[PDB]
Amino acid sequence: MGHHHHHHSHMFIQTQDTPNPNSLKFIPGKPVLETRTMDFPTPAAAFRSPLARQLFRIEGVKSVFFGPDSITVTKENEELDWNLLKPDIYATIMDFFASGLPLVTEE
Incomplete structure (x- = not known):
């Protein structure tokens, strides 16, 4: 199906x-x-x-870490506010699960 069951995906990031x-x-x-x-x-x-790879495309991402229902991201420098990154972070991760790509390709 083209459209997604977004009414309750529970794909919203806190x-x-x-x-x-x-x-x-x-x-x-x-x-x-x-x-x-x-x-x-x-x-x-x-x-x-x-x-x-898609998170390192976002303006300000120094490093990414994945954990149990958690993605801990670090900024390049302290001059960067997270509000610069956040719209792109939400969009990209929701797009990733909308594509249904494997979280890990190899270890």
């Missing part, structure tokens, strides 16, 4: 603040990595996830 001013935690409502956790410190390491 932001939870952390003990790091440069990093913010994004809970999508669905376990991205219940099975494990995977770090992406560098834009190169991001190859192990299509989502991580």
Whole structure:
């Protein structure tokens, strides 16, 4: 079907603040990595996830981390406010699950 069951996808991301001013935690409502956790410190390491690659496309993303129903992203520098990234972050992750791409391609 072309159109999605968006009325209750539970694909809406809540932001939870952390003990790091440069990093913010994004809970999508669905376990991205219940099975494990995977770090992406560098834009190169991001190859192990299509989502991580798409997150490094967003203006301000220094690094991405995946965890149990959580995506913890860090900014390049403190001059960057998260409101610059947030619209693109929501759009890209909801688009990822709308595409239904595998969270991990290889470890």
